[PDB]
């Protein structure tokens, strides 16, 4: 059984649009999305389909770029640091569940390095 996916809207949560959050969607996310290694991270981990019934026994704060993208489109975040923390949760979950050198980890590491390149300079 997969858990419910993380929320992409929350009426009790204050919304905001900043230049930096616009940039995270238009430039950072949408460029990472097109990377050849992006596909495992474009939706919540489907532990059933992948026959990983221990995934959500280990990973208790799941995150994926599909959730992040919908959050950005919904202005779910208050600032860019909130969105960047979601990215870092997604990368860290992959390194927690997997082992150095695994094909999936090499993919995550490729994206994380590109992610770090892209957020080195945010608009003002
Ligand atoms: O294919 N996947 O979606 C996937 C995503 C993230 C992960 O940490 C995975 N680990 C093992 C197998 C598939 C994984």
UniProtKB/Swiss-Prot annotation:
Changing residue 98 to A: Abolishes binding to acetylated histones. Ubiquitously expressed. Phosphorylation by CK2 disrupt the intramolecular binding between the bromo domain 2 and the NPS region and promotes binding between the NPS and the BID regions, leading to activate the protein and promote binding to acetylated histones. In absence of phosphorylation, BRD4 does not localize to p53/TP53 target gene promoters, phosphorylation promoting recruitment to p53/TP53 target promoters. There is a cross-link at residue 57 (Glycyl lysine isopeptide (Lys-Gly) (interchain with G-Cter in SUMO2)). The record marks 98 as: Acetylated histone binding. Transmembrane segments: none annotated. It is found in: Nucleus; Chromosome. It comes from the Eukaryota. Residues 16-122 form the Bromo domain. Belongs to the BET family. Interacts with p53/TP53; the interaction is direct. Interacts (via CTD region) with CDK9 and CCNT1, acting as an associated component of P-TEFb complex. Interacts with RELA (when acetylated at 'Lys-310'). Interacts (via NET domain) with NSD3, CHD4, BICRA and ATAD5. The interaction with BICRA bridges BRD4 to the GBAF complex. Interacts (via NET domain) with JMJD6 (via JmjC and N-terminal domains); the interaction is stronger in presence of ssRNA and recruits JMJD6 on distal enhancers. Interacts with NSD3. Interacts with NIPBL. (Microbial infection) Interacts with bovine papillomavirus type 1 regulatory protein E2. This interactions may serve for the tethering of viral genomes to host mitotic chromosomes allowing successful partitioning of the viral genome during cell division. Chromatin reader protein that recognizes and binds acetylated histones and plays a key role in transmission of epigenetic memory across cell divisions and transcription regulation. Remains associated with acetylated chromatin throughout the entire cell cycle and provides epigenetic memory for postmitotic G1 gene transcription by preserving acetylated chromatin status and maintaining high-order chromatin structure. During interphase, plays a key role in regulating the transcription of signal-inducible genes by associating with the P-TEFb complex and recruiting it to promoters. JQ1, a thieno-triazolo-1,4-diazepine derivative, and I-BET, a benzodiazepine derivative, have been tested on tumors with success. Treatment with GSK1210151A (I-BET151, a I-BET derivative) has strong effets on mixed lineage leukemia and promotes myeloid differentiation and leukemia stem-cell depletion. It is linked to Cornelia de Lange syndrome 6: A form of Cornelia de Lange syndrome, a clinically heterogeneous developmental disorder associated with malformations affecting multiple systems. It is characterized by facial dysmorphisms, abnormal hands and feet, growth delay, cognitive retardation, hirsutism, gastroesophageal dysfunction and cardiac, ophthalmologic and genitourinary anomalies. CDLS6 inheritance is autosomal dominant. The NET domain mediates interaction with a number of chromatin proteins involved in transcription regulation (NSD3, JMJD6, CHD4, GLTSCR1 and ATAD5). This is Bromodomain-containing protein 4. It comes from Homo sapiens (Human). The gene is BRD4. The chain holds residues 44 to 166 of 1362 of the full protein.
């Amino acid at each position: 059984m997969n858990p419910p996916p993380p929320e992409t809207s929350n009426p009790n949560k204050p919304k905001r649009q900043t230049n930096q959050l616009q940039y995270l969607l238009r430039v950072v996310l949408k460029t990472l999305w097109k990377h050849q290694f992006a596909w495992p991270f474009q939706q919540p981990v489907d532990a059933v389909k992948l026959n990983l019934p221990d995934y959500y026994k280990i990973i208790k704060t799941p995150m994926d770029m599909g959730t992040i993208k919908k959050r950005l489109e919904n202005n779910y975040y208050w600032n860019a640091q909130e969105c960047i923390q979601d990215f870092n949760t997604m990368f860290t979950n992959c390194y927690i569940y997997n082992k150095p050198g695994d094909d999936i980890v090499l993919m995550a590491e490729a994206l994380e390095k590109l992610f770090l390149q892209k957020i080195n300079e945010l608009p003002t």
